[PDB]
Amino acid sequence: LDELKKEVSMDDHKLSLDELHNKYGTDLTRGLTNARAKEILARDGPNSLTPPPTTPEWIKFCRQLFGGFSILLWIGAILCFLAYGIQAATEDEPANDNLYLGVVLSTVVIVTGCFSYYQEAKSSRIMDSFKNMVPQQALVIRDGEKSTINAEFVVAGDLVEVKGGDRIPADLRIISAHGCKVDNSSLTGESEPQTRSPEFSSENPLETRNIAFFSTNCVEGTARGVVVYTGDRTVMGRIATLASGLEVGRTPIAIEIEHFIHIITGVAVFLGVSFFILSLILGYSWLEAVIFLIGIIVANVPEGLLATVTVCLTLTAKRMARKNCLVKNLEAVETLGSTSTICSDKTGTLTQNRMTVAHMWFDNQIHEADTTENQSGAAFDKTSATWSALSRIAALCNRAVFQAGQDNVPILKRSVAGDASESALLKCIELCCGSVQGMRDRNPKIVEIPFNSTNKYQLSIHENEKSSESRYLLVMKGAPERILDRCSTILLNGAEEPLKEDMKEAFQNAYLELGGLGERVLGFCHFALPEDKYNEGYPFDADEPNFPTTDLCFVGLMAMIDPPRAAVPDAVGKCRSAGIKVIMVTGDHPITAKAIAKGVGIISEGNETIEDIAARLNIPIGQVNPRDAKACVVHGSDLKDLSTEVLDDILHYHTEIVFARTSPQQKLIIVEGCQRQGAIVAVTGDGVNDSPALKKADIGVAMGISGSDVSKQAADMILLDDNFASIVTGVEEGRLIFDNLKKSIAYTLTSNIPEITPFLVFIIGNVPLPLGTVTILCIDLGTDMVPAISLAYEQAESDIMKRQPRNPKTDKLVNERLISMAYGQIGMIQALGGFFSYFVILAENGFLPMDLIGKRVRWDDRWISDVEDSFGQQWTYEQRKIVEFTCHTSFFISIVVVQWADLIICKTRRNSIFQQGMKNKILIFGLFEETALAAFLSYCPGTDVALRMYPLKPSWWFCAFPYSLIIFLYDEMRRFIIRRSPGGWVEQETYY
Amino acid sequence: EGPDNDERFTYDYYRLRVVGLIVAAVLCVIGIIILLAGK
Amino acid sequence: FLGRTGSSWFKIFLFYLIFYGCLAGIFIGTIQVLLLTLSDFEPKYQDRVAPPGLSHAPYAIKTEISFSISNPKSYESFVKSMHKLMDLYNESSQAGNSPFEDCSDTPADYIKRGDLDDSQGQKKACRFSRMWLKNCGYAEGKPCVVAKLNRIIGFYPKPLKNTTDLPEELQANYNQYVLPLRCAAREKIGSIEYFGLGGYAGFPLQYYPYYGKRLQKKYLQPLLAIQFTNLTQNMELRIECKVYGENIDYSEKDRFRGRFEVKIEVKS
Ligand SMILES: *[C@@H]1O[C@H](CO)[C@@H](O[C@@H]2O[C@H](CO)[C@@H](O)[C@H](O)[C@H]2NC(C)=O)[C@H](O)[C@H]1NC(C)=O
Ligand SMILES: CC(C)CCC[C@@H](C)[C@H]1CC[C@H]2[C@@H]3CC=C4C[C@@H](O)CC[C@]4(C)[C@H]3CC[C@]12C
Ligand SMILES: *[C@@H]1O[C@H](CO)[C@@H](O)[C@H](O)[C@H]1NC(C)=O
Ligand SMILES: [K+]
Ligand SMILES: [Mg+2]
Ligand SMILES: [Tl+]
Ligand SMILES: [Tl+]
């Protein structure tokens, strides 16, 4: 469906103005007829974007109500009402058991539904942001007259007019223009104004001057044009549809959840029906056969687990909110940890998005300035008298000014009225020479010649601030070579000197080096005009050369670039040390893209492209073995004629990849290419041209300050302070939460065994029921909750940023090793500790373990109010039941006591508690509150009716203590083996 | 005692409940203290 | 295979065999020590049987015994359980001076055979003739229910003293030696008739205290036969038999705590 939109567009900028009118039945001068425009409206439809059909929240909520655990809990809830119905008909049961348990279980499903619904959130308003880029109104020429109309009423063929400050209402063929410049950052991510004129200037319509696009704005001048595309058919309207239309897809974390749901659901249905038939064979009435099944359901399903996961995710997202990293989708909290490839935009993401002075060439020396936002570098020069001469030209031969009321904000961050290069120079001098306004007050400008297309220079004449002179100084800047052809002397370390071929060659060298760094280079020179030839009232003519512009003194060079953000180089290296592959994907030109790649460490030192090898060896590129080149730089124009299989080979064959001059669909294609190889991919960006890629990414991260509204709609995560170091933190947090989820899951599952085994022995042994159904829910929904959550606050056991990204095909959240430990080893020890306390309670009340076998028949018989114990005493029905429920209560408390040790062992997968310590305060809180809850549930009056919880005698609490301790020792010995031999036996069997 | 051994079939479940609830409360307070050591 | 290789499948079996073996051996060990802390003659706790339960022979479907007099197999179900109990009180079962003893044919005081020790043989229990149960196949019309006080080791059932007012106000009040049992329904549409030891409507105190199964096997607890020769027919009659005493109490939950709940209906 969207495969059409993933392709490069076709256009009609090649046609003549006249020819273009024939195609759209239009007038170049009079414009369309009121009738013809209305006709075309009904024909083509409105100049608007329609949002894609969404899934209502209704269906979204209910889709969770049927996912493995909820299905089993539904079967339980209904099976409760089943047994209740069968009762209400047969023998009038005045009880509330099956009825209430059926109500409780149905509530558990609904509430669990809210948790998973909260986790599976999708806040997407892509198409809405795009719609915000179409103006409310447009100016059209109809019947030879200009009028404002609803922009939706704009059709292909009419004559539109735009001017500085307004949004392009539709894709236009420029037919007339006067000084028109446009901001195409929507399509390129670059905000430098692009001229628009009627002349065709490139075969590529996205590069030609005679096309203006919807989603962009006119920055200055005026233009008229013929509408060629409207609504969804515009270049960026298609990007809108592509972006808004892209299928979301399941996250890595989501896939893991479903996976263990299958496992646990599997064992649940297995043991469920395996013992349902095992009971009927033993001659159990279907009346009972279902009651046992309900218990089996409740025992096997970890009722509180899915909600635990959600809370652990939420708590991890809260910590990241506190580092200026907003998470829109709870699952995106983990994806960053599983990320193996980052596709990053350059401008406004890796870079500050601001032309900044990078180097200066004066005194036959290359000086480097500090490009960082917060200025974390050092000085270059202050002493040289040459510097002050260059500094003066940079301030004086400059027409840029700071906007009013910025004195509060830092120099480099403040808004400037002017072109990017003049702003850069302004901020450079203001920083290291103080107020520039002061320099422009001490040296009043009397005449100037602003930068001309033809002159290729800008000159200014000022009254020298010096009192002993107060004469006229000439300054000029422009193209380095043009400035050179106008110089005779060079200000070396203070004093001038003739411009010999020697210094002239050093100039060329300096010029070539700075240009090689991808930096824009300017020349600077001045000339102190002779006093006798220029009186204090001498008039200077700016129109006609009234003053010399030759034999001037060359002062120096200055170079500039849109520099990396301070934290970016280090963040890139850190991603790469964690084994994450970092690719650059930018709409910017290749020379600039490549230079920043080396600056931030995308391309490491020494690595070459095929073009680099060819130039170094002075040989044809076809003569170069492409396998000798680990780095590559792909232009979008070449990308366009490559198949995906060939794109896949590029991705496979290079470690250091730069995709430059890419369109928005091309970014999507590169992302998909990476994913196709089985990689989890993150995208980082800030422009509307990142929207499709951000949507398709497993996780999209947008910049918060510099980011466009669209990009932040398309993302899963926002960096609110533009701190790229947050990606590094995000991946670290993502890995940590992945491990801690394992700990929390094992902990929760472990207590399933002591809830399952009592029901089994109840059938096979014919003893009184050791633990009840209600009692199970008091564990999974009550006591285990806070402890399970607390594992989310566990510190790393080792340097997680030192390991490679997990293999999502092999490294699962819940594997066989977890089940073996939780179900086969620790849970089994917990089961016994439960049974022990059960036998203790009964034996101390007169029913010794031996006489318990095959007694349930008489025990449950409501009409036998005289059962004989081991000592020959006789018990009524309600009397023995009180002891039985007291058994449920102590078995319950036994679970809590054995979960104490389990909580401590689940703390660490490898390390010892004596190494990791007990610095998790939430965990300790869990221990205290868990025990408080259990005690309250046993001793609070009335709980014997609502939950069948009975007061325990002090000695009862200590039954499971020896089992709780064996768990601690056992797991500590086991992990001691793991560490002592990384070989594999204990490791490959039990290492979560 | 002999025929007056009524105490043999008696248990102070009332005190046990009072003590049990005291303990539960104090464990609840202790937990808050440790948690609130930083929020 | 599914998971691993044969070598791995073996090792995982050798482990869980030794592992579960140890766990079973430990579980058994903790059961040993538990038993080691317990007496053979007396349970550690008795507060959960404390107030004695009162149970009868007619096995009630739901605290009810409804049947038809004009039908044979209508009551043959209740006669099965009635027989089961009384079959134990046979004279052939009580033979010789061992381990039985002839006790007062009239309600007497308690009998202490020492302590709950094995320092003596089987503590000798009082004989009880089912022949003390006058009038009661059993009552084919108007049932002859048999009551019973639940056995509790070392329990001395103490009758109420005639200090103040009483339900069966002072009638045949053998204050010193009889634990009374008065059945009731207002709703007085019946005819209560009690049979027992010495002809009294109670339990003779000479059968106490019970020394337990280990120290007193073949021991016999006193019975109290109750006959309802009601002149009514074809209606559910809720009859409650209540025992009175210092050590006797009741509960709204446990409807068998020192009392009966019988729903007789001679639907004939
Ligand atoms: C306990 O006493 C009952 C009294 O009914 C015995 O029942 C006797 O059963 C036999 C054989 O079935 C009959 O011939 C008699 O008529 C019954 N009564 C009597 C008085 O002998 C019953 O057998 C006795 N049980 C034991 C174990 O001795
Ligand atoms: C109540 C009692 C009788 C039930 C005992 C169940 C035992 C036999 C179960 C419980 C947990 C189970 C193990 C759980 C995990 C694994 C790892 C997997 O890669 C192979 C199977 C294996 C090794 C299972 C084998 C059987 C097992 C040990
Ligand atoms: C009980 O049986 C006796 C004979 O043993 C008889 O005289 C008497 O009438 C019976 N009593 C009743 C109330 O039927
Ligand atoms: K995404
Ligand atoms: Mg950008
Ligand atoms: Tl469970
Ligand atoms: Tl659990």
Structure tokens at A182: 């446009």
Domains and CATH numbers, chain C: 1-38 (1.20.5.170), 39-268 (2.60.40.1660)
Per the rule left: phi > 0, alpha: psi between -120 and 50, beta: everything else, A481 is: alpha
Helix (H) or strand (E) holding A281: helix A252-281
Residues whose CB falls within 8 Å of the CB of residue A360, separated by 6 or more in sequence, listed in order? A366, A367, A369, A380, A381, A390, A556, A557, A558, A559
CATH architecture, range A1-46+126-245: Distorted Sandwich (2.70)
Q: Which amino acid is at A291?
A: I
φ, ψ of residue A652 in degrees (nearest 5) = -70, -35
Question: CA-CA distance, A207 to A690, in Å (whole number)?
Answer: 19
Tokens (6 digits) for A373: 């936002």
**Half-sphere CA count of A716, side-chain side, radius 13 A:** 30
3-state DSSP call for residue A824?
Answer: helix
User: Is the separation of the CB atoms in A354 and A562 below 8 Å?
Assistant: yes
- Dmax (CA) for chain C in angstroms is 87
Residue ranges, comma separated, of all CATH 3.40.50.1000 domains in chain A are 340-352+564-724
Residue A170, judged by CB atoms within 10 A of its CB (0-12, 13-18, 19+), counts as buried
CA–CA dist A522, A511 (Å, integer): 9
Please, what sign has the CA dihedral across residues A280, A284, A290, A293? Answer: negative
| Nearest CA among A134, A474, A118 for reference residue A327 | A118
From A414, A452, A447, A444, select the one nearest A431 (Cα to Cα): A414
Distance in angstroms (rounded) separating the CA atoms of residues A510 and A522: 12
A366 membership: H or E segment, kind and range? strand A365-368
Q: What are phi and psi of C191, to 5 degrees?
A: -165, 90
CA-nearest residue for atom 3, ligand 3, is C135
Residues for chain B: how many in total?
Answer: 39
**Dist CA A93 CA A238 (whole Å):** 67
Among candidate residues C241, C230, C240, the one with its CA nearest the CA of residue C265 = C230
| DSSP per-residue letters across A563-628 | PBPTTHHHHHHHHHHTT-EEEEE-SS-HHHHHHHHHHHTSS-TT---HHHHHHHTT--GGGS-GGG
Going by the DSSP 8-state scheme, the letter that residue C2 receives in this structure is: -
Amino acid A94 reads P
A368 bridge partner residues: A359
**CA trace torsion A436, A441, A443, A448 (10° rounding):** 80
Peptide bond into C159 cis (omega under 30): no
Q: What letter represents residue A125's amino acid?
A: R
Contact A120, A249 (CB under 8 A): no
Structure tokens at A383: 């002493």
Contact C23 A828 (CB under 8 A): yes
Residue B25 at interface with chain A, using a CB cutoff of 8 Å: yes
* Beta carbons of A966 and C26 less than 8 Å apart: yes
Reading the block at residue A232, the tokens are 């969804």
Residue of chain B whose Cα is closest to the Cα of A920: B35
CB atoms within 10 A of CB A626: 15
Q: Tell me the fold of A353-563.
A: Calcium-transporting ATPase, cytoplasmic domain N (3.40.1110)
Residues A340-352+564-724, CATH architecture = 3-Layer(aba) Sandwich (3.40)
Helix (DSSP H) and strand (DSSP E) numbers for chain A: 39, 27
Q: Which method resolved this structure? A: X-ray
Q: Which residue type does A118 have? A: Y
- C-alpha C149/C-alpha C138 separation (Å) is 21
Rg of chain A over Cα atoms, rounded to whole angstroms, equals 38
Cβ count within 10 A of residue A374: 12
Q: How far is CA C29 from CA A912, A962, C24, in A?
A: 29, 11, 9
- Catalytic status, residue A345: yes
Polymer length of chain C: 268
Sign of CA dihedral C88, C91, C97, C101: positive
Q: Helices (H) and strands (E) in chain C — how many of each?
A: 2, 10
Mutual angle of helices A921-939 and A877-905, in 10-degree steps: 180
Dihedral angle sign, alpha carbons of residues A937, A939, A943, A949 = positive
Specify the amino acid at residue A497.
E
List chain C residues with CB under 8 Å of A879.
Answer: 48-49, 53, 254, 257
Per CATH, domain A63-116+246-339+725-992 is 1.20.1110.10: yes
Residue A962, both tokens: 């020896």
Q: Tokens 């506190």 label which residue?
A: A322
Beta bridge partner(s), residue A684 = A344, A701
Q: Using CA atoms, how far apart are residues A711 and A87, in angstroms rounded to an integer?
A: 61
C36 Cβ partners below 8 Å, 6+ apart?
Answer: none
| Contact residues for A157 (Cβ-Cβ < 8 A; gap 6+) | A24, A25, A26, A32, A36, A37, A40, A226, A227
Distance A698 CA to ligand 4 centre (A): 5
Residues 195-224 of C with CB under 8 A from A: 210, 212-214, 216, 219
How much of chain C is helix, strand and coil, in % rounded to 5? Answer: 20, 20, 60
Resolution of this entry, Å: 2.6
What residues are paired with A342 via a beta bridge? Answer: A582, A682
How many CA atoms are closer than 13 Å to the CA of A683, on its beta-carbon side?
A: 32
Ligand 3 mutation target, pool C131, C133, C135, C226, most atoms within 8 A of CB: C135
Quick one: DSSP state of residue A782? Answer: I
Q: What angle do CA C21, C26, C32 make, to 5 degrees?
A: 130
Residues A483 and A456 sit within 8 Å (Cβ to Cβ): no
First to last CA, chain C: 72
C141 lines ligand 3 (CB under 6 A): no
- Written as one string, the DSSP assignment of A621-678 is GGGS-GGG--EEEEEHHHHTT--HHHHHHHHHH-SEEEEES--HHHHHHHHHHHHHTT
By the 10 Å C-beta count (0-12 exposed, 13-18 middle, 19+ buried), A57 is classed as: exposed
- From residue A619, alpha-carbon distances to A613, A615, A739 in Å are 8, 7, 52
Q: How many CA atoms lie within 13 A of C31 on its CB side?
A: 16
A645 is in an annotated binding site: no
Closest atom of ligand 1 relative to the C87 alpha carbon: 1
Alpha-carbon distance of A168 to A135, in angstroms, equals 8
- Could you list the beta-strand ranges (E) of A696-853: 699-703, 717-719
Written as one letter, the residue type at A526 is H
Strand pairing report for C262-266 and C237-243: antiparallel
| Non-local CB neighbours of A536 within 8 Å, separated by 6+ positions | A470, A471
C68 lines ligand 3 (CB under 6 A): no
Compute how many other C-beta atoms are within 10 angstroms of the C-beta atom of residue A264: 22
CATH 2.70.150.10 residue spans of chain A: 1-46+126-245
Residue to test with chain A: of C5, C7, C33, C34, most A Cβ within 10 A: C34
Residue A932 and residue B21: Cβ atoms within 8 Å? no
Residue (of C229, C151, C219, C218) closest to C183 by Cα position: C229
Between CA A404 and CA A417 the distance in angstroms is: 10
Instruction: Find, among A705, A659, A695, the residue nearest to A240 by Cα.
Output: A695
Q: Which of A394, A385, A535 is nearest to A460 (CA)?
A: A394
Q: Specify the 3-state DSSP secondary structure of A461.
A: strand
Integer CA distances (angstroms), C186 to A982, C238, C239, C260, C264, in order: 85, 12, 12, 18, 17
Contact between residue A881 and residue C55 where contact means Cβ atoms under 8 Å apart: no
Cβ neighbours of A450 (radius 10 Å): 10
Facing B9 at nearest CB: one of C47, C110, C112: C47
Please tell me which chains touch C, using 3 or more CB pairs under 8 Å as the contact test: A, B
Q: For residue C18, give both structure tokens.
A: 């030794």
Q: Mark C138-147 as b/e (b = at least 16 C-beta within 10 Å).
A: bbbebbbbbb
**Spatial distance between the Cα atoms of A383 and A432, rounded to a whole number of angstroms:** 12
| Residue of A561, A578, A569, A553 whose CA lies nearest to A522 | A561
Output the CA–CA distances (angstroms, integers) from residue C159 to A182, C169, C179, in the order listed: 110, 14, 5
Cα dist from A126 to A432, A587, A714, C112, whole Å: 44, 20, 6, 93
Burial of C148 (0-12, 13-18, 19+ CB in 10 A): buried
For residues A429 and A395, is the Cβ–Cβ distance under 8 A? Answer: yes
Query: In angstroms, rounded to a whole number, what is the distance separating the alpha carbons of residues A192 and A594?
Result: 19
What is each CA distance from A313 to A68, A306, A310, A339, A340, in whole angstroms?
Answer: 21, 11, 5, 17, 21
Q: Write down how long chain A is.
A: 992
Q: Which residues contact A179 (CB under 8 A, 6 or more apart)?
A: A220, A221, A222
Amino acid occupying residue C229: T
Listed in sequence order, the DSSP H helices in A45-96 are 57-62, 69-89
**In contact, A27 and A21? CB cutoff 8 Å:** yes
A613 and A630 Cβ atoms separated by less than 8 Å: no
